[PDB]
Structures are given as C-alpha cells and as structure tokens.
Design an enzyme around this catalytic site. Structure first.
Site, PDB file in Angstrom:
ATOM      1  N   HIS A  61       0.825  -1.226   0.000  1.00  0.00           N
ATOM      2  CA  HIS A  61       0.000   0.000   0.000  1.00  0.00           C
ATOM      3  C   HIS A  61       0.849   1.262   0.000  1.00  0.00           C
ATOM      4  O   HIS A  61       0.425   2.266  -0.587  1.00  0.00           O
ATOM      5  CB  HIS A  61      -0.932   0.149   1.211  1.00  0.00           C
ATOM      6  CG  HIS A  61      -1.381  -1.175   1.710  1.00  0.00           C
ATOM      7  ND1 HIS A  61      -1.278  -1.622   2.987  1.00  0.00           N
ATOM      8  CD2 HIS A  61      -1.939  -2.181   0.980  1.00  0.00           C
ATOM      9  CE1 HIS A  61      -1.759  -2.839   3.051  1.00  0.00           C
ATOM     10  NE2 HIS A  61      -2.166  -3.201   1.849  1.00  0.00           N
ATOM     11  N   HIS A  91       5.320   7.194   6.522  1.00  0.00           N
ATOM     12  CA  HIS A  91       5.083   6.755   5.159  1.00  0.00           C
ATOM     13  C   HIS A  91       4.543   7.935   4.357  1.00  0.00           C
ATOM     14  O   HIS A  91       4.285   8.995   4.928  1.00  0.00           O
ATOM     15  CB  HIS A  91       4.115   5.573   5.151  1.00  0.00           C
ATOM     16  CG  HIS A  91       2.780   5.967   5.700  1.00  0.00           C
ATOM     17  ND1 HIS A  91       2.543   5.953   7.066  1.00  0.00           N
ATOM     18  CD2 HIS A  91       1.646   6.425   5.103  1.00  0.00           C
ATOM     19  CE1 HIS A  91       1.284   6.357   7.257  1.00  0.00           C
ATOM     20  NE2 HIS A  91       0.743   6.665   6.099  1.00  0.00           N
ATOM     21  N   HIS A  93       1.878   9.037   0.779  1.00  0.00           N
ATOM     22  CA  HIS A  93       0.864   8.828  -0.223  1.00  0.00           C
ATOM     23  C   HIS A  93       1.228   9.719  -1.411  1.00  0.00           C
ATOM     24  O   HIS A  93       1.628  10.866  -1.178  1.00  0.00           O
ATOM     25  CB  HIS A  93      -0.534   9.176   0.287  1.00  0.00           C
ATOM     26  CG  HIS A  93      -0.879   8.459   1.553  1.00  0.00           C
ATOM     27  ND1 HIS A  93      -1.615   7.301   1.585  1.00  0.00           N
ATOM     28  CD2 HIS A  93      -0.541   8.701   2.841  1.00  0.00           C
ATOM     29  CE1 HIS A  93      -1.750   6.882   2.832  1.00  0.00           C
ATOM     30  NE2 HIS A  93      -1.096   7.720   3.631  1.00  0.00           N
ATOM     31  N   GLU A 103      -3.648  13.407   0.370  1.00  0.00           N
ATOM     32  CA  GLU A 103      -4.892  12.965   0.974  1.00  0.00           C
ATOM     33  C   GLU A 103      -5.691  14.165   1.438  1.00  0.00           C
ATOM     34  O   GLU A 103      -6.785  14.477   0.953  1.00  0.00           O
ATOM     35  CB  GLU A 103      -4.574  11.989   2.109  1.00  0.00           C
ATOM     36  CG  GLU A 103      -3.815  10.767   1.615  1.00  0.00           C
ATOM     37  CD  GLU A 103      -4.155   9.493   2.346  1.00  0.00           C
ATOM     38  OE1 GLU A 103      -3.829   9.421   3.548  1.00  0.00           O
ATOM     39  OE2 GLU A 103      -4.724   8.581   1.702  1.00  0.00           O
ATOM     40  N   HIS A 116       3.140  11.188   6.255  1.00  0.00           N
ATOM     41  CA  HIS A 116       2.460  10.894   7.495  1.00  0.00           C
ATOM     42  C   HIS A 116       3.475  10.348   8.512  1.00  0.00           C
ATOM     43  O   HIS A 116       4.008   9.262   8.328  1.00  0.00           O
ATOM     44  CB  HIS A 116       1.337   9.881   7.335  1.00  0.00           C
ATOM     45  CG  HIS A 116       0.178  10.468   6.579  1.00  0.00           C
ATOM     46  ND1 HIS A 116      -0.812   9.729   5.995  1.00  0.00           N
ATOM     47  CD2 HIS A 116      -0.093  11.756   6.331  1.00  0.00           C
ATOM     48  CE1 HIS A 116      -1.645  10.558   5.421  1.00  0.00           C
ATOM     49  NE2 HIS A 116      -1.267  11.809   5.598  1.00  0.00           N
ATOM     50  N   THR A 195      -6.438   6.698   7.321  1.00  0.00           N
ATOM     51  CA  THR A 195      -6.931   6.989   5.963  1.00  0.00           C
ATOM     52  C   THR A 195      -6.919   5.752   5.085  1.00  0.00           C
ATOM     53  O   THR A 195      -7.289   5.827   3.905  1.00  0.00           O
ATOM     54  CB  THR A 195      -6.117   8.072   5.229  1.00  0.00           C
ATOM     55  OG1 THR A 195      -4.780   7.610   5.054  1.00  0.00           O
ATOM     56  CG2 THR A 195      -6.016   9.358   6.031  1.00  0.00           C
ATOM     57  N   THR A 196      -6.524   4.621   5.656  1.00  0.00           N
ATOM     58  CA  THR A 196      -6.644   3.332   4.986  1.00  0.00           C
ATOM     59  C   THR A 196      -7.422   2.374   5.898  1.00  0.00           C
ATOM     60  O   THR A 196      -7.451   2.662   7.114  1.00  0.00           O
ATOM     61  CB  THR A 196      -5.302   2.680   4.626  1.00  0.00           C
ATOM     62  OG1 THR A 196      -4.619   2.222   5.819  1.00  0.00           O
ATOM     63  CG2 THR A 196      -4.352   3.658   3.965  1.00  0.00           C
TER      64      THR A 196
HETATM   65  N1  SDA Z   1      -1.814   1.241  10.352  1.00  0.00           N
HETATM   66  C1  SDA Z   1      -1.966   2.541   9.824  1.00  0.00           C
HETATM   67  C2  SDA Z   1      -2.945   2.785   8.854  1.00  0.00           C
HETATM   68 CL1  SDA Z   1      -3.910   1.391   8.409  1.00  0.00          CL
HETATM   69  C3  SDA Z   1      -3.089   4.063   8.331  1.00  0.00           C
HETATM   70  C4  SDA Z   1      -2.281   5.123   8.746  1.00  0.00           C
HETATM   71  S1  SDA Z   1      -2.425   6.777   8.111  1.00  0.00           S
HETATM   72  N2  SDA Z   1      -2.327   6.657   6.633  1.00  0.00           N
HETATM   73  O1  SDA Z   1      -1.327   7.570   8.651  1.00  0.00           O
HETATM   74  O2  SDA Z   1      -3.774   7.184   8.503  1.00  0.00           O
HETATM   75  C5  SDA Z   1      -1.292   4.867   9.724  1.00  0.00           C
HETATM   76  C6  SDA Z   1      -1.159   3.579  10.241  1.00  0.00           C
HETATM   77 CL2  SDA Z   1       0.037   3.227  11.432  1.00  0.00          CL
HETATM   78 ZN    ZN Z   2      -0.946   7.673   5.640  1.00  0.00          ZN
END
Ligand code: SDA
Ligand code: ZN
EC number: 4.2.1.1
Length: 256
Positions: A61, A91, A93, A103, A116, A195-196
């Site tokens: 992802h 990470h 996006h 996002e 993020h 957001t996932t």
């Molecule tokens: N597990 C996980 C998921 Cl599923 C989404 C996010 S996010 N993209 O920072 O909201 C951050 C984490 Cl740590």
């Molecule tokens: Zn994220």
C-alpha cells in the site's frame, strides 16, 4: 483485498469497513477561510533528535520507515495534544502525476504527495491499545510539492530500488526524520481517522501548512515502486491516496 483500484478502491472499503462512512473520517479538505485560529493551542513540540530508524518496508500500500518505539525518544507533544505521543513509523501517499497525490487538500488543492508521521499515545502502553481509543494516535501530516530537491529525503529515495515489491524490506538505520520537516510548524488540526482500512477513528490530525519541496526525480522514484509482489505483473505504486471525506460535525483549528 482492499486497494486503490476500480474494484477494490476507496469507494468499496465501506463494505468490509463500515466505519468508512463514519462521523470522523480522514482525510478532509481544509477550507482555509473556515478554519479558525485557536489561542488555546499550546506550542507544538517535535522532538526527533534521538529517533532510531530500523527498517523500511513495502507493505503493498505504501512503504513504511519504521522506528524503535520501545522507549521514550522521538516524541510529539503540545499543540492540541494531551501528553506524550511516540513515533512508530512514517510513510507517504503520492500520485501518478504531480497534480495529485495528497490525501488532505487545502482549499481543494491537491499536492503531489503527503508525508504521514505516525505517533501513539504512550498513556495506552502500546500501539494496539492506543487504536482502541479516541485519542490514541497523532499523525503529523506534511505536504510535498515538486521543485527543488529535499536532501533529507534522498536516503529514502535511494533504497526504494531494494524494496520494489510487496513484502520486501531493507535495513534502514540511522535515518533522521528532522530532515523532512519544513521551517515552520504552523498547522491545522482536527479529529479524524486512519486513511486506509481499518479506518479507525483514533487520530488527532496535525497538518503542517508549509509544504516541503522534493524534486521531480525524487518523486519519480516513488512511482517506480510496485503494489504487486515479486514475480507478479507490474502494478505501479501510484495514486495510493484516499480522497477527502465529509467533515460532518467537526471544526478545523489553526495554530496561527
Ligand atoms: N496502520 C496505519 C494505517 Cl492502516 C493508516 C495510517 S495513516 N495513513 O497515517 O492514517 C497509519 C497507520 Cl500506522
Ligand atoms: Zn498515511
């Protein structure tokens, strides 16, 4: 088998994850004229000089730069936050082209990508417990625009070749996330969600106003990653962003 495609993308997530149509979903559009300055916000504190990165991972992802969160070191505190939140990973996006990829949006503007930095509230003892709490997480969101290179990013960019496909990882020690921050810590904040999937409504979002600039070449390397596993037909890892969600009964506050 959620993803970002036509048959498994964000318009499908609500089937396995009904909270997708919940009351505090992320991301959102930030209407800069509707956001109100909040004098009750305290100074934001980003203390990353003892951060210890360990590994980088293509999870199918995005790619996660993971940190040693077994002790108190890299923490986010202040601002809207009560107490202490510990850095666990960051990470990104990003998009297929520079005109999309973030996002959150700002007055409906889409940036090329969004960083993020994920932190969990140490009062709950572990990440797992924190994502059962309405204040379990804080994500520091930073926009990326394309122009000059970000020197602090290049170490990330250059290891991506070694984790092209889903499930691949590489050692990634001694990475300093202070190198990804803009000059200013002016931000917007609101309560939201992951957001996932599983889209848990456990997150205090802190979105910096100042984007960082990265070079075209740098983001082009992000788009060389794959969603697929080794030996599978190539699906480039691009457009791994969720669109803006309904604000509902929320207010976005400005620190400035
Ligand atoms: N597990 C996980 C998921 Cl599923 C989404 C996010 S996010 N993209 O920072 O909201 C951050 C984490 Cl740590
Ligand atoms: Zn994220």
């Amino acid at each position: 088998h959620w993803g970002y495609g036509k048959h498994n993308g964000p318009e499908h997530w609500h089937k396995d994850f009904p909270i997708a149509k919940g009351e505090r979903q992320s991301p959102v559009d930030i209407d800069t004229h509707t956001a109100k300055y909040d004098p009750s916000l305290k100074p934001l504190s980003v203390s990353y000089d003892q951060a210890t990165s360990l590994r980088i991972l293509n999870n199918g992802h995005a790619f996660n730069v993971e940190f040693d969160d077994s002790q108190d070191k890299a923490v986010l505190k202040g601002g809207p936050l009560d107490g202490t939140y510990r850095l666990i990973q960051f990470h990104f996006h990003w998009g297929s082209l520079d005109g999309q990829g973030s996002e959150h949006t700002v007055d409906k503007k889409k940036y090329a990508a969004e960083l993020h930095l994920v932190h969990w509230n140490t009062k709950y003892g572990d990440f797992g417990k924190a994502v059962q709490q309405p204040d379990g997480l804080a994500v520091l969101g930073i926009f990326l625009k394309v122009g000059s290179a970000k020197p602090g990013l290049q170490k990330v960019v250059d290891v991506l070749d070694s984790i092209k496909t889903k499930g691949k990882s590489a050692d990634f020690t001694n990475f300093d996330p202070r190198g990804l921050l803009p000059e200013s810590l002016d931000y917007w904040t609101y309560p939201g969600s992951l957001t996932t999937p599983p889209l848990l409504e456990c997150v205090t979002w802190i979105v910096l106003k100042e984007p960082i600039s990265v070079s075209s070449e740098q983001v082009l390397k992000f788009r060389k990653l794959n969603f697929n596993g080794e030996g599978e037909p190539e699906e480039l890892m691009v457009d791994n962003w969720r669109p803006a969600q309904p604000l509902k009964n929320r207010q976005i506050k400005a620190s400035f």
